[PDB]
């Protein structure tokens, strides 16, 4: 979607408030020591690199319009729409391992800091405002955002495997949402899922992301169909060639 500058003010302010509320008084890994990143963290970091490249390419071609829209698609459509939801199973679980907490919070704050730096040429005052409040926790120093270094993409942090995993998680989550809307099921009700025609990558992606899926898609259970199992009558969606079944039995 095209994103207006003024709408992005609101989006950035609210994102920053969420990040601050979820990092104040907590360890953001500002010490520079090891954290534990999941493929969700690696995905958003990889997307950030690609965005740095495209914004810079467009600025180099004097296309402020295209540079802003590439940035805004990252901030609005990836970071806000998805990453800020996908971190919730860690941020809101008191028993999340401390290294995962550190990795999640570091990632949240470093990506925000970089997004602010990239947006400064378009929206200097709001970005400066927020930056001054988060720079300490992001591990950045300097008096003003305008004279900070321009970000340079690190090809070593591009991670196509993580990206493919999170695109699968998105498609599964959207497929379940779409079934809820169609069957007028509350977004709150826990439901059972069956997966039909699941490849080995599907299985690996499920094993890796099961706890997140259960929490965020509000699932009672999720399992692959047993070899030679008949599948009960259900609403369906597709994630590639895999089909996602919600048995009607329940609702």
PDB file of N, CA and C in Angstrom, residues 26-121:
ATOM      1  N   UNK A  26      14.507  -3.503  31.475  1.00  0.00           N
ATOM      2  CA  UNK A  26      14.880  -4.837  31.051  1.00  0.00           C
ATOM      3  C   UNK A  26      16.232  -4.769  30.321  1.00  0.00           C
ATOM      4  N   UNK A  27      16.850  -5.932  30.105  1.00  0.00           N
ATOM      5  CA  UNK A  27      18.170  -6.022  29.466  1.00  0.00           C
ATOM      6  C   UNK A  27      17.981  -6.051  27.926  1.00  0.00           C
ATOM      7  N   UNK A  28      18.474  -5.040  27.239  1.00  0.00           N
ATOM      8  CA  UNK A  28      18.429  -4.985  25.787  1.00  0.00           C
ATOM      9  C   UNK A  28      19.713  -5.420  25.138  1.00  0.00           C
ATOM     10  N   UNK A  29      20.580  -6.066  25.898  1.00  0.00           N
ATOM     11  CA  UNK A  29      21.844  -6.543  25.381  1.00  0.00           C
ATOM     12  C   UNK A  29      22.790  -5.466  24.940  1.00  0.00           C
ATOM     13  N   UNK A  30      22.735  -4.335  25.656  1.00  0.00           N
ATOM     14  CA  UNK A  30      23.513  -3.168  25.322  1.00  0.00           C
ATOM     15  C   UNK A  30      24.946  -3.471  25.640  1.00  0.00           C
ATOM     16  N   UNK A  31      25.185  -4.363  26.605  1.00  0.00           N
ATOM     17  CA  UNK A  31      26.567  -4.862  26.848  1.00  0.00           C
ATOM     18  C   UNK A  31      27.314  -5.424  25.625  1.00  0.00           C
ATOM     19  N   UNK A  32      26.644  -5.681  24.494  1.00  0.00           N
ATOM     20  CA  UNK A  32      27.336  -6.237  23.289  1.00  0.00           C
ATOM     21  C   UNK A  32      27.678  -7.755  23.366  1.00  0.00           C
ATOM     22  N   UNK A  33      27.300  -8.437  24.460  1.00  0.00           N
ATOM     23  CA  UNK A  33      27.621  -9.846  24.696  1.00  0.00           C
ATOM     24  C   UNK A  33      26.581 -10.761  23.954  1.00  0.00           C
ATOM     25  N   UNK A  34      26.820 -12.123  23.867  1.00  0.00           N
ATOM     26  CA  UNK A  34      25.867 -12.982  23.111  1.00  0.00           C
ATOM     27  C   UNK A  34      24.395 -13.028  23.626  1.00  0.00           C
ATOM     28  N   UNK A  35      23.491 -13.130  22.656  1.00  0.00           N
ATOM     29  CA  UNK A  35      22.073 -13.359  22.844  1.00  0.00           C
ATOM     30  C   UNK A  35      21.662 -14.561  22.006  1.00  0.00           C
ATOM     31  N   UNK A  36      20.430 -15.003  22.179  1.00  0.00           N
ATOM     32  CA  UNK A  36      19.877 -16.023  21.377  1.00  0.00           C
ATOM     33  C   UNK A  36      18.802 -15.469  20.446  1.00  0.00           C
ATOM     34  N   UNK A  37      19.055 -15.514  19.138  1.00  0.00           N
ATOM     35  CA  UNK A  37      18.130 -15.035  18.140  1.00  0.00           C
ATOM     36  C   UNK A  37      17.357 -16.228  17.553  1.00  0.00           C
ATOM     37  N   UNK A  38      16.062 -16.102  17.270  1.00  0.00           N
ATOM     38  CA  UNK A  38      15.333 -17.133  16.562  1.00  0.00           C
ATOM     39  C   UNK A  38      15.296 -16.765  15.075  1.00  0.00           C
ATOM     40  N   UNK A  39      14.693 -17.605  14.242  1.00  0.00           N
ATOM     41  CA  UNK A  39      14.539 -17.237  12.838  1.00  0.00           C
ATOM     42  C   UNK A  39      13.618 -16.011  12.687  1.00  0.00           C
ATOM     43  N   UNK A  40      12.725 -15.759  13.638  1.00  0.00           N
ATOM     44  CA  UNK A  40      11.901 -14.521  13.573  1.00  0.00           C
ATOM     45  C   UNK A  40      12.818 -13.263  13.693  1.00  0.00           C
ATOM     46  N   UNK A  41      13.740 -13.271  14.649  1.00  0.00           N
ATOM     47  CA  UNK A  41      14.684 -12.180  14.786  1.00  0.00           C
ATOM     48  C   UNK A  41      15.583 -12.077  13.552  1.00  0.00           C
ATOM     49  N   UNK A  42      16.090 -13.222  13.092  1.00  0.00           N
ATOM     50  CA  UNK A  42      16.965 -13.193  11.924  1.00  0.00           C
ATOM     51  C   UNK A  42      16.268 -12.675  10.649  1.00  0.00           C
ATOM     52  N   UNK A  43      14.989 -13.038  10.509  1.00  0.00           N
ATOM     53  CA  UNK A  43      14.171 -12.512   9.430  1.00  0.00           C
ATOM     54  C   UNK A  43      14.100 -10.975   9.430  1.00  0.00           C
ATOM     55  N   UNK A  44      13.690 -10.388  10.551  1.00  0.00           N
ATOM     56  CA  UNK A  44      13.499  -8.951  10.535  1.00  0.00           C
ATOM     57  C   UNK A  44      14.841  -8.237  10.299  1.00  0.00           C
ATOM     58  N   UNK A  45      15.927  -8.801  10.830  1.00  0.00           N
ATOM     59  CA  UNK A  45      17.248  -8.214  10.622  1.00  0.00           C
ATOM     60  C   UNK A  45      17.668  -8.295   9.151  1.00  0.00           C
ATOM     61  N   UNK A  46      17.359  -9.412   8.516  1.00  0.00           N
ATOM     62  CA  UNK A  46      17.644  -9.591   7.103  1.00  0.00           C
ATOM     63  C   UNK A  46      16.835  -8.606   6.262  1.00  0.00           C
ATOM     64  N   UNK A  47      15.540  -8.514   6.551  1.00  0.00           N
ATOM     65  CA  UNK A  47      14.694  -7.515   5.870  1.00  0.00           C
ATOM     66  C   UNK A  47      15.206  -6.071   5.993  1.00  0.00           C
ATOM     67  N   UNK A  48      15.720  -5.727   7.191  1.00  0.00           N
ATOM     68  CA  UNK A  48      16.328  -4.454   7.435  1.00  0.00           C
ATOM     69  C   UNK A  48      17.502  -4.213   6.511  1.00  0.00           C
ATOM     70  N   UNK A  49      18.391  -5.203   6.367  1.00  0.00           N
ATOM     71  CA  UNK A  49      19.478  -5.025   5.428  1.00  0.00           C
ATOM     72  C   UNK A  49      19.006  -4.731   4.022  1.00  0.00           C
ATOM     73  N   UNK A  50      18.060  -5.523   3.543  1.00  0.00           N
ATOM     74  CA  UNK A  50      17.532  -5.313   2.177  1.00  0.00           C
ATOM     75  C   UNK A  50      16.930  -3.910   2.008  1.00  0.00           C
ATOM     76  N   UNK A  51      16.264  -3.441   3.059  1.00  0.00           N
ATOM     77  CA  UNK A  51      15.686  -2.105   3.084  1.00  0.00           C
ATOM     78  C   UNK A  51      16.739  -1.016   3.071  1.00  0.00           C
ATOM     79  N   UNK A  52      17.813  -1.154   3.830  1.00  0.00           N
ATOM     80  CA  UNK A  52      18.921  -0.232   3.762  1.00  0.00           C
ATOM     81  C   UNK A  52      19.465  -0.114   2.366  1.00  0.00           C
ATOM     82  N   UNK A  53      19.603  -1.241   1.673  1.00  0.00           N
ATOM     83  CA  UNK A  53      20.077  -1.227   0.312  1.00  0.00           C
ATOM     84  C   UNK A  53      19.146  -0.442  -0.634  1.00  0.00           C
ATOM     85  N   UNK A  54      17.868  -0.730  -0.561  1.00  0.00           N
ATOM     86  CA  UNK A  54      16.888  -0.136  -1.491  1.00  0.00           C
ATOM     87  C   UNK A  54      16.732   1.391  -1.186  1.00  0.00           C
ATOM     88  N   UNK A  55      16.621   1.764   0.086  1.00  0.00           N
ATOM     89  CA  UNK A  55      16.533   3.176   0.455  1.00  0.00           C
ATOM     90  C   UNK A  55      17.743   3.906  -0.072  1.00  0.00           C
ATOM     91  N   UNK A  56      18.930   3.347   0.143  1.00  0.00           N
ATOM     92  CA  UNK A  56      20.120   4.027  -0.301  1.00  0.00           C
ATOM     93  C   UNK A  56      20.185   4.134  -1.833  1.00  0.00           C
ATOM     94  N   UNK A  57      19.857   3.055  -2.545  1.00  0.00           N
ATOM     95  CA  UNK A  57      19.802   3.068  -3.983  1.00  0.00           C
ATOM     96  C   UNK A  57      18.879   4.207  -4.493  1.00  0.00           C
ATOM     97  N   UNK A  58      17.735   4.351  -3.867  1.00  0.00           N
ATOM     98  CA  UNK A  58      16.776   5.333  -4.322  1.00  0.00           C
ATOM     99  C   UNK A  58      17.190   6.745  -3.974  1.00  0.00           C
ATOM    100  N   UNK A  59      17.788   6.931  -2.812  1.00  0.00           N
ATOM    101  CA  UNK A  59      18.377   8.245  -2.475  1.00  0.00           C
ATOM    102  C   UNK A  59      19.486   8.665  -3.419  1.00  0.00           C
ATOM    103  N   UNK A  60      20.325   7.697  -3.795  1.00  0.00           N
ATOM    104  CA  UNK A  60      21.371   7.925  -4.763  1.00  0.00           C
ATOM    105  C   UNK A  60      20.829   8.351  -6.126  1.00  0.00           C
ATOM    106  N   UNK A  61      19.610   7.946  -6.445  1.00  0.00           N
ATOM    107  CA  UNK A  61      18.949   8.295  -7.716  1.00  0.00           C
ATOM    108  C   UNK A  61      18.024   9.471  -7.546  1.00  0.00           C
ATOM    109  N   UNK A  62      18.101  10.153  -6.407  1.00  0.00           N
ATOM    110  CA  UNK A  62      17.324  11.370  -6.120  1.00  0.00           C
ATOM    111  C   UNK A  62      15.820  11.066  -5.977  1.00  0.00           C
ATOM    112  N   UNK A  63      15.452   9.808  -5.752  1.00  0.00           N
ATOM    113  CA  UNK A  63      14.034   9.432  -5.680  1.00  0.00           C
ATOM    114  C   UNK A  63      13.627   9.330  -4.207  1.00  0.00           C
ATOM    115  N   UNK A  64      13.404  10.478  -3.603  1.00  0.00           N
ATOM    116  CA  UNK A  64      12.932  10.517  -2.238  1.00  0.00           C
ATOM    117  C   UNK A  64      11.623   9.807  -2.029  1.00  0.00           C
ATOM    118  N   UNK A  65      10.754   9.912  -3.023  1.00  0.00           N
ATOM    119  CA  UNK A  65       9.456   9.280  -3.062  1.00  0.00           C
ATOM    120  C   UNK A  65       9.597   7.761  -2.993  1.00  0.00           C
ATOM    121  N   UNK A  66      10.443   7.201  -3.858  1.00  0.00           N
ATOM    122  CA  UNK A  66      10.640   5.759  -3.818  1.00  0.00           C
ATOM    123  C   UNK A  66      11.413   5.300  -2.564  1.00  0.00           C
ATOM    124  N   UNK A  67      12.367   6.080  -2.089  1.00  0.00           N
ATOM    125  CA  UNK A  67      13.138   5.760  -0.895  1.00  0.00           C
ATOM    126  C   UNK A  67      12.261   5.701   0.321  1.00  0.00           C
ATOM    127  N   UNK A  68      11.381   6.708   0.456  1.00  0.00           N
ATOM    128  CA  UNK A  68      10.444   6.703   1.593  1.00  0.00           C
ATOM    129  C   UNK A  68       9.480   5.544   1.541  1.00  0.00           C
ATOM    130  N   UNK A  69       8.898   5.262   0.378  1.00  0.00           N
ATOM    131  CA  UNK A  69       7.957   4.153   0.305  1.00  0.00           C
ATOM    132  C   UNK A  69       8.611   2.763   0.615  1.00  0.00           C
ATOM    133  N   UNK A  70       9.854   2.565   0.177  1.00  0.00           N
ATOM    134  CA  UNK A  70      10.547   1.313   0.499  1.00  0.00           C
ATOM    135  C   UNK A  70      10.754   1.242   2.032  1.00  0.00           C
ATOM    136  N   UNK A  71      11.153   2.339   2.652  1.00  0.00           N
ATOM    137  CA  UNK A  71      11.308   2.361   4.089  1.00  0.00           C
ATOM    138  C   UNK A  71      10.003   2.100   4.758  1.00  0.00           C
ATOM    139  N   UNK A  72       8.975   2.812   4.308  1.00  0.00           N
ATOM    140  CA  UNK A  72       7.660   2.716   4.967  1.00  0.00           C
ATOM    141  C   UNK A  72       7.042   1.326   4.865  1.00  0.00           C
ATOM    142  N   UNK A  73       7.266   0.648   3.751  1.00  0.00           N
ATOM    143  CA  UNK A  73       6.818  -0.733   3.620  1.00  0.00           C
ATOM    144  C   UNK A  73       7.496  -1.644   4.634  1.00  0.00           C
ATOM    145  N   UNK A  74       8.794  -1.436   4.857  1.00  0.00           N
ATOM    146  CA  UNK A  74       9.460  -2.182   5.914  1.00  0.00           C
ATOM    147  C   UNK A  74       8.877  -1.856   7.285  1.00  0.00           C
ATOM    148  N   UNK A  75       8.768  -0.586   7.627  1.00  0.00           N
ATOM    149  CA  UNK A  75       8.324  -0.206   8.974  1.00  0.00           C
ATOM    150  C   UNK A  75       6.889  -0.653   9.204  1.00  0.00           C
ATOM    151  N   UNK A  76       5.992  -0.304   8.289  1.00  0.00           N
ATOM    152  CA  UNK A  76       4.604  -0.564   8.477  1.00  0.00           C
ATOM    153  C   UNK A  76       4.238  -2.044   8.278  1.00  0.00           C
ATOM    154  N   UNK A  77       4.629  -2.587   7.145  1.00  0.00           N
ATOM    155  CA  UNK A  77       4.231  -3.919   6.717  1.00  0.00           C
ATOM    156  C   UNK A  77       5.046  -5.106   7.260  1.00  0.00           C
ATOM    157  N   UNK A  78       6.272  -4.893   7.693  1.00  0.00           N
ATOM    158  CA  UNK A  78       7.112  -5.989   8.230  1.00  0.00           C
ATOM    159  C   UNK A  78       7.340  -5.797   9.710  1.00  0.00           C
ATOM    160  N   UNK A  79       8.012  -4.728  10.086  1.00  0.00           N
ATOM    161  CA  UNK A  79       8.332  -4.487  11.494  1.00  0.00           C
ATOM    162  C   UNK A  79       7.084  -4.344  12.367  1.00  0.00           C
ATOM    163  N   UNK A  80       6.165  -3.401  12.035  1.00  0.00           N
ATOM    164  CA  UNK A  80       4.961  -3.189  12.843  1.00  0.00           C
ATOM    165  C   UNK A  80       3.937  -4.264  12.658  1.00  0.00           C
ATOM    166  N   UNK A  81       3.606  -4.640  11.427  1.00  0.00           N
ATOM    167  CA  UNK A  81       2.525  -5.564  11.234  1.00  0.00           C
ATOM    168  C   UNK A  81       2.863  -6.940  11.746  1.00  0.00           C
ATOM    169  N   UNK A  82       4.116  -7.345  11.607  1.00  0.00           N
ATOM    170  CA  UNK A  82       4.502  -8.711  11.930  1.00  0.00           C
ATOM    171  C   UNK A  82       5.478  -8.822  13.058  1.00  0.00           C
ATOM    172  N   UNK A  83       6.644  -8.181  12.990  1.00  0.00           N
ATOM    173  CA  UNK A  83       7.614  -8.431  14.014  1.00  0.00           C
ATOM    174  C   UNK A  83       7.099  -8.096  15.432  1.00  0.00           C
ATOM    175  N   UNK A  84       6.434  -6.939  15.587  1.00  0.00           N
ATOM    176  CA  UNK A  84       5.914  -6.548  16.864  1.00  0.00           C
ATOM    177  C   UNK A  84       4.833  -7.500  17.394  1.00  0.00           C
ATOM    178  N   UNK A  85       4.201  -8.293  16.551  1.00  0.00           N
ATOM    179  CA  UNK A  85       3.273  -9.331  16.998  1.00  0.00           C
ATOM    180  C   UNK A  85       4.072 -10.602  17.335  1.00  0.00           C
ATOM    181  N   UNK A  86       4.992 -10.964  16.436  1.00  0.00           N
ATOM    182  CA  UNK A  86       5.766 -12.206  16.579  1.00  0.00           C
ATOM    183  C   UNK A  86       6.689 -12.252  17.798  1.00  0.00           C
ATOM    184  N   UNK A  87       7.073 -11.103  18.344  1.00  0.00           N
ATOM    185  CA  UNK A  87       7.866 -11.125  19.568  1.00  0.00           C
ATOM    186  C   UNK A  87       7.043 -11.365  20.856  1.00  0.00           C
ATOM    187  N   UNK A  88       5.727 -11.198  20.769  1.00  0.00           N
ATOM    188  CA  UNK A  88       4.919 -11.242  21.973  1.00  0.00           C
ATOM    189  C   UNK A  88       5.063 -12.540  22.811  1.00  0.00           C
ATOM    190  N   UNK A  89       5.221 -13.719  22.158  1.00  0.00           N
ATOM    191  CA  UNK A  89       5.400 -14.978  22.924  1.00  0.00           C
ATOM    192  C   UNK A  89       6.635 -14.990  23.778  1.00  0.00           C
ATOM    193  N   UNK A  90       7.639 -14.231  23.420  1.00  0.00           N
ATOM    194  CA  UNK A  90       8.805 -14.040  24.281  1.00  0.00           C
ATOM    195  C   UNK A  90       8.618 -12.916  25.277  1.00  0.00           C
ATOM    196  N   UNK A  91       8.184 -11.753  24.822  1.00  0.00           N
ATOM    197  CA  UNK A  91       8.073 -10.583  25.723  1.00  0.00           C
ATOM    198  C   UNK A  91       7.098 -10.841  26.846  1.00  0.00           C
ATOM    199  N   UNK A  92       6.055 -11.631  26.609  1.00  0.00           N
ATOM    200  CA  UNK A  92       5.012 -11.756  27.560  1.00  0.00           C
ATOM    201  C   UNK A  92       5.036 -13.079  28.320  1.00  0.00           C
ATOM    202  N   UNK A  93       6.067 -13.887  28.137  1.00  0.00           N
ATOM    203  CA  UNK A  93       6.216 -15.124  28.874  1.00  0.00           C
ATOM    204  C   UNK A  93       7.295 -14.921  29.941  1.00  0.00           C
ATOM    205  N   UNK A  94       6.935 -14.940  31.223  1.00  0.00           N
ATOM    206  CA  UNK A  94       7.915 -14.736  32.328  1.00  0.00           C
ATOM    207  C   UNK A  94       8.976 -15.816  32.347  1.00  0.00           C
ATOM    208  N   UNK A  95       8.679 -16.980  31.785  1.00  0.00           N
ATOM    209  CA  UNK A  95       9.671 -18.023  31.704  1.00  0.00           C
ATOM    210  C   UNK A  95      10.413 -18.119  30.412  1.00  0.00           C
ATOM    211  N   UNK A  96      10.312 -17.115  29.524  1.00  0.00           N
ATOM    212  CA  UNK A  96      11.162 -17.166  28.325  1.00  0.00           C
ATOM    213  C   UNK A  96      12.628 -17.152  28.759  1.00  0.00           C
ATOM    214  N   UNK A  97      13.465 -18.000  28.162  1.00  0.00           N
ATOM    215  CA  UNK A  97      14.883 -17.992  28.583  1.00  0.00           C
ATOM    216  C   UNK A  97      15.509 -16.604  28.521  1.00  0.00           C
ATOM    217  N   UNK A  98      16.353 -16.254  29.476  1.00  0.00           N
ATOM    218  CA  UNK A  98      16.918 -14.920  29.528  1.00  0.00           C
ATOM    219  C   UNK A  98      17.690 -14.518  28.245  1.00  0.00           C
ATOM    220  N   UNK A  99      18.346 -15.477  27.588  1.00  0.00           N
ATOM    221  CA  UNK A  99      19.014 -15.134  26.311  1.00  0.00           C
ATOM    222  C   UNK A  99      18.102 -14.857  25.153  1.00  0.00           C
ATOM    223  N   UNK A 100      16.934 -15.481  25.165  1.00  0.00           N
ATOM    224  CA  UNK A 100      15.921 -15.192  24.146  1.00  0.00           C
ATOM    225  C   UNK A 100      15.288 -13.819  24.427  1.00  0.00           C
ATOM    226  N   UNK A 101      15.019 -13.531  25.692  1.00  0.00           N
ATOM    227  CA  UNK A 101      14.583 -12.194  26.097  1.00  0.00           C
ATOM    228  C   UNK A 101      15.558 -11.106  25.644  1.00  0.00           C
ATOM    229  N   UNK A 102      16.842 -11.310  25.882  1.00  0.00           N
ATOM    230  CA  UNK A 102      17.883 -10.395  25.468  1.00  0.00           C
ATOM    231  C   UNK A 102      17.945 -10.252  23.951  1.00  0.00           C
ATOM    232  N   UNK A 103      17.894 -11.366  23.226  1.00  0.00           N
ATOM    233  CA  UNK A 103      17.942 -11.321  21.774  1.00  0.00           C
ATOM    234  C   UNK A 103      16.757 -10.615  21.166  1.00  0.00           C
ATOM    235  N   UNK A 104      15.583 -10.864  21.730  1.00  0.00           N
ATOM    236  CA  UNK A 104      14.316 -10.268  21.257  1.00  0.00           C
ATOM    237  C   UNK A 104      14.375  -8.753  21.523  1.00  0.00           C
ATOM    238  N   UNK A 105      14.750  -8.340  22.748  1.00  0.00           N
ATOM    239  CA  UNK A 105      14.777  -6.934  23.075  1.00  0.00           C
ATOM    240  C   UNK A 105      15.883  -6.202  22.334  1.00  0.00           C
ATOM    241  N   UNK A 106      17.053  -6.832  22.146  1.00  0.00           N
ATOM    242  CA  UNK A 106      18.082  -6.193  21.418  1.00  0.00           C
ATOM    243  C   UNK A 106      17.632  -5.917  20.007  1.00  0.00           C
ATOM    244  N   UNK A 107      17.085  -6.951  19.408  1.00  0.00           N
ATOM    245  CA  UNK A 107      16.611  -6.860  18.060  1.00  0.00           C
ATOM    246  C   UNK A 107      15.543  -5.772  17.888  1.00  0.00           C
ATOM    247  N   UNK A 108      14.588  -5.765  18.775  1.00  0.00           N
ATOM    248  CA  UNK A 108      13.518  -4.781  18.712  1.00  0.00           C
ATOM    249  C   UNK A 108      14.068  -3.330  18.710  1.00  0.00           C
ATOM    250  N   UNK A 109      14.977  -3.089  19.615  1.00  0.00           N
ATOM    251  CA  UNK A 109      15.486  -1.746  19.813  1.00  0.00           C
ATOM    252  C   UNK A 109      16.517  -1.349  18.729  1.00  0.00           C
ATOM    253  N   UNK A 110      17.364  -2.267  18.290  1.00  0.00           N
ATOM    254  CA  UNK A 110      18.349  -1.943  17.250  1.00  0.00           C
ATOM    255  C   UNK A 110      17.652  -1.682  15.910  1.00  0.00           C
ATOM    256  N   UNK A 111      16.625  -2.469  15.594  1.00  0.00           N
ATOM    257  CA  UNK A 111      15.917  -2.279  14.348  1.00  0.00           C
ATOM    258  C   UNK A 111      15.120  -0.963  14.384  1.00  0.00           C
ATOM    259  N   UNK A 112      14.491  -0.667  15.519  1.00  0.00           N
ATOM    260  CA  UNK A 112      13.843   0.633  15.676  1.00  0.00           C
ATOM    261  C   UNK A 112      14.809   1.789  15.479  1.00  0.00           C
ATOM    262  N   UNK A 113      15.977   1.715  16.121  1.00  0.00           N
ATOM    263  CA  UNK A 113      16.977   2.761  16.041  1.00  0.00           C
ATOM    264  C   UNK A 113      17.378   2.975  14.558  1.00  0.00           C
ATOM    265  N   UNK A 114      17.623   1.888  13.861  1.00  0.00           N
ATOM    266  CA  UNK A 114      18.030   2.009  12.458  1.00  0.00           C
ATOM    267  C   UNK A 114      16.900   2.573  11.586  1.00  0.00           C
ATOM    268  N   UNK A 115      15.670   2.119  11.812  1.00  0.00           N
ATOM    269  CA  UNK A 115      14.464   2.617  11.112  1.00  0.00           C
ATOM    270  C   UNK A 115      14.326   4.172  11.318  1.00  0.00           C
ATOM    271  N   UNK A 116      14.566   4.638  12.530  1.00  0.00           N
ATOM    272  CA  UNK A 116      14.555   6.063  12.829  1.00  0.00           C
ATOM    273  C   UNK A 116      15.648   6.809  12.037  1.00  0.00           C
ATOM    274  N   UNK A 117      16.846   6.261  12.017  1.00  0.00           N
ATOM    275  CA  UNK A 117      17.920   6.852  11.264  1.00  0.00           C
ATOM    276  C   UNK A 117      17.609   6.951   9.794  1.00  0.00           C
ATOM    277  N   UNK A 118      17.067   5.865   9.236  1.00  0.00           N
ATOM    278  CA  UNK A 118      16.671   5.870   7.832  1.00  0.00           C
ATOM    279  C   UNK A 118      15.525   6.836   7.511  1.00  0.00           C
ATOM    280  N   UNK A 119      14.628   7.071   8.459  1.00  0.00           N
ATOM    281  CA  UNK A 119      13.455   7.920   8.246  1.00  0.00           C
ATOM    282  C   UNK A 119      13.763   9.423   8.490  1.00  0.00           C
ATOM    283  N   UNK A 120      14.887   9.708   9.111  1.00  0.00           N
ATOM    284  CA  UNK A 120      15.249  11.092   9.433  1.00  0.00           C
ATOM    285  C   UNK A 120      15.249  12.069   8.233  1.00  0.00           C
ATOM    286  N   UNK A 121      15.693  11.633   7.028  1.00  0.00           N
ATOM    287  CA  UNK A 121      15.684  12.530   5.885  1.00  0.00           C
ATOM    288  C   UNK A 121      14.250  12.897   5.512  1.00  0.00           C
TER     289      UNK A 121
END
